[PDB]
């Protein structure tokens, strides 16, 4: 059989159920999900890569097809207007024939402007869920992405079905295959660009195939949080390596990060090691009922406990915390839900210190320690400048920073660290 296919059946049933609750709560005849269209480059004839509407790939693993429409009410079989053009120019895939095809009443669409006769006769009562408000309005839809319907699905999107969890496991598997190849490459001393190419080859992913734009940084670039470029020339000296990169599976994202030392023995190599442990401990705290805010205060606690131990700051943890200086070394959140979207949706009425970690939710735990001169500077401009070992900073500054991020499934009974279980030390 197909473990995935057996899971899918329940996935559909879950979405169907949520579709019924919501159109009732808002008195709708049904919800229409538009996959989107391709965007044309200004004054050109080229297009940007296509990126499906999350709300559409939520139902099925069709992420590379524009002009597809889902119309459902939760009780009847959902309709799938599937775009399958015909023209010798582009290769034509066979009609939908995989396990999910059976769960929809599929109607083939050959021309994007022919969709109206395939849609409901009276559209006034169906909610349009998509980006092209103009096109919907032309077809007769009047309810444009109703906040109530959007927040509803978004709220439940935080609770991953079994098919979703399996999908995400697959995405993690592919992503580590590449996080290791990218590792080897760093140690072989290749450039950021070469390593990035290594990661793509190992994940069999094209650049536009991955969930977000990879961060492949070396030495001081590791401090650029949102580093996007890829130097083509390998640094003179290879010191530090930080790579934030994921992979995709049926529309679900993986979001892993790893920092490395080139040798594996100096101060920095030591710093990373602390972080790893800190990271794993923060990972170990996830449990239904916990408030993210607690793991937050604890991450910052551990940061300060690290800044004090490596004499980066000549104070104690409680004071680095208290005086409020841990944020200039760890300037971002500890984690975020993740699924169909890297920084996934959810939460009571459209990550907070108040939100509660619940079962079947997926998270990233990504604590970090960075030496970001811009942020480092503003610290020297306050009467805290005194309490810091600047000589120590410049001693590490050339390594940029550290980040370790895993993707963890939270079960009612336990934690499943997809990343580490796949053995990515």
Ligand X SMILES: CC(C)NP(=O)(O)NC(C)C
Binding site for ligand X (CB under 6 A): 212, 215, 225-226, 244, 255, 332, 342, 364, 366, 405
Minimal distance, residue 55 CB to a second copy, in Å: 15
Nearer to a second copy, 270 or 358 (CB): 358
Which x/- pattern over 72-101 shows residues binding a second copy (rule: CB under 8 A)? ---x--------------------------
142 is in an annotated binding site: no
When asked if residue 413 is in the footprint of a second copy (CB under 8 A), the reply is yes
Token pair, residue 295, equals 């793991």
When asked if residue 389 is in the footprint of a second copy (CB under 8 A), the reply is no
When asked if residue 255 is in the footprint of Mn ion (CB under 5 A), the reply is yes
Distance from the Cα of residue 65 to its chain's centroid: 21
Out of 101, 144, 287, 393, which residue is the one contacting a second copy (CB under 8 A)? 287
Out of 90, 91, 117, 226, which residue is the one contacting Mn ion (CB under 5 A)? 226
225 binds, among ligand X, a second copy, Mn ion, none (CB under 5 to 8 A by kind): ligand X
What span, in angstroms and rounded, lies between the C-alpha atoms of 321 and 324?
Answer: 5
Can you tell me which residue has the tokens 């079994």?
162
Minimal distance, residue 233 CB to ligand X, in Å: 23
Which x/- pattern over 164-183 shows residues binding a second copy (rule: CB under 8 A)? -xx-----------------
Minimal distance, residue 154 CB to a second copy, in Å: 9
What span, in angstroms and rounded, lies between the C-alpha atoms of 197 and 182?
Answer: 8
337 is in an annotated binding site: no
By CB under 8 A, which span of 36-44, 124-132, 386-394, 414-422 interacts with a second copy? 414-422
By CB under 8 A, which span of 1-9, 30-38, 91-99, 390-398 interacts with a second copy? 1-9
Token pair, residue 424, equals 């990515």
Out of 50, 132, 155, 212, which residue is the one contacting a second copy (CB under 8 A)? 155
162 binds, among a second copy, ligand X, Mn ion, none (CB under 5 to 8 A by kind): a second copy
In Å, how far are 24, 49, 164, 417 from 421, measured between CA atoms?
A: 42, 33, 18, 6
Residue 35, SS3 per DSSP: coil
From 25, 118, 20, select the one nearest 67 (Cα to Cα). 118
When asked if residue 145 is in the footprint of a second copy (CB under 8 A), the reply is no
Out of 156, 238, 239, 300, which residue is the one contacting a second copy (CB under 8 A)? 156
Can you tell me which residue has the tokens 């100096």?
266
Sequence-distant (≥ 6) Cβ neighbours of residue 41 within 8 angstroms: 47, 48
105 binds, among a second copy, ligand X, Mn ion, none (CB under 5 to 8 A by kind): Mn ion
Out of 364, 407, 417, 419, which residue is the one contacting Mn ion (CB under 5 A)? 364
205 is in an annotated binding site: no
Token pair, residue 20, equals 């019924």
What span, in angstroms and rounded, lies between the C-alpha atoms of 217 and 224?
Answer: 8
Nearer to a second copy, 56 or 153 (CB): 153
Token pair, residue 373, equals 């001169």
C-alpha angle with apex 64: 339 to 155, nearest 5 degrees?
Answer: 30
What span, in angstroms and rounded, lies between the C-alpha atoms of 267 and 392?
Answer: 10
Q: What are phi and psi of 312, to 5 degrees?
A: -75, -35
Nearer to a second copy, 106 or 150 (CB): 150
64 is in an annotated binding site: no
263, 255 contact by CB (below 8 A): no
Site for a second copy in 342-371 (CB under 8 A): 348-349, 354, 356
295, 282 contact by CB (below 8 A): yes
277, 349 contact by CB (below 8 A): no
From 160, 168, 170, select the one nearest 11 (Cα to Cα). 160
Three-class secondary structure assignment of 30-61 = EEEEECCCCCECCCCCCECCCCCCHHHHCCCC
User: Which residue positions form the known binding site for Mn(2+)?
Assistant: 244, 255, 336, 366, 405
Contacting residues toward a second copy, per CB under 8 A: 3, 6-7, 21, 24-25, 27, 75, 148, 151-152, 155-156, 162, 165-166, 287-289, 348-349, 354, 356, 411-416
């Amino acid at each position: 059989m197909n473990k995935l296919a057996v899971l899918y059946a329940e996935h559909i049933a879950t979405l169907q159920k949520r579709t019924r609750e919501i159109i009732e709560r808002e008195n709708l005849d049904g919800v229409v999900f538009h996959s989107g269209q391709a965007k044309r480059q200004f004054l050109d004839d080229m297009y940007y890569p296509f990126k499906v509407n999350p709300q559409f790939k939520a139902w099925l693993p069709v992420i590379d097809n524009p002009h597809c429409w889902i119309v459902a009410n939760g009780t009847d079989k959902p309709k799938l207007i599937f775009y399958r053009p015909v023209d010798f120019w582009h290769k034509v895939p066979d009609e939908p024939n995989e396990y999910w095809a059976d769960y929809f009443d599929i109607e083939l669409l050959v021309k994007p402007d022919q969709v109206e006769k395939l849609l409901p006769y009276d559209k006034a009562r169906f909610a349009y869920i998509g980006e092209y408000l103009e096109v919907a309005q032309a077809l007769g839809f009047e309810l444009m992405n109703p906040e109530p319907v959007m927040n509803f699905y978004h709220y439940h999107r935080a609770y991953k079905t079994q098919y979703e969890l399996a999908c995400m496991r697959e995405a993690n598997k592919i992503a580590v295959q590449g996080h290791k190849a990218a590792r080897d490459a760093f140690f072989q001393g290749k450039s950021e660009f070469e390593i990035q190419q290594a990661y793509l080859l190992a994940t069999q992913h094209s650049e536009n195939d991955n969930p977000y734009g990879n961060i492949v940084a070396l030495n001081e670039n590791c401090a650029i949080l949102h580093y996007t470029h890829f130097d083509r020339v390998a640094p003179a000296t290879h010191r530090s390596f930080l790579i934030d990169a994921g992979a995709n599976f049926n529309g679900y994202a993986a979001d892993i990060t790893r920092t490395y030392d080139f040798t594996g023995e100096g101060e920095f190599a030591e710093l990373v090691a602390t972080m790893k442990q800190h990271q794993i401990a923060l990972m170990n705290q996830l449990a239904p009922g916990k408030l993210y805010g607690e793991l937050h205060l604890d991450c910052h606690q551990r940061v300060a406990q690290t800044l004090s131990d490596f004499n980066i700051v000549d104070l104690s943890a409680d004071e680095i915390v208290a005086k409020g200086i841990t944020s200039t070394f760890f300037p971002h959140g500890l984690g975020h839900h993740i699924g169909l979207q890297v920084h996934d949706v959810g939460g009571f009425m459209a990550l907070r210190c108040t939100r509660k970690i619940e079962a079947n939710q997926v998270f990233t735990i990504e604590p970090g320690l960075y030496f970001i001169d811009s942020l480092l500077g503003d610290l020297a401009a306050t009467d805290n400048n005194q309490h810091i070992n600047w000589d120590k900073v410049a001693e590490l500054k050339p390594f940029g920073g550290i980040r370790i991020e895993d993707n963890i499934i939270v079960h009612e009974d336990s934690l499943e660290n997809m990343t580490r279980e796949l053995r990515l030390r």
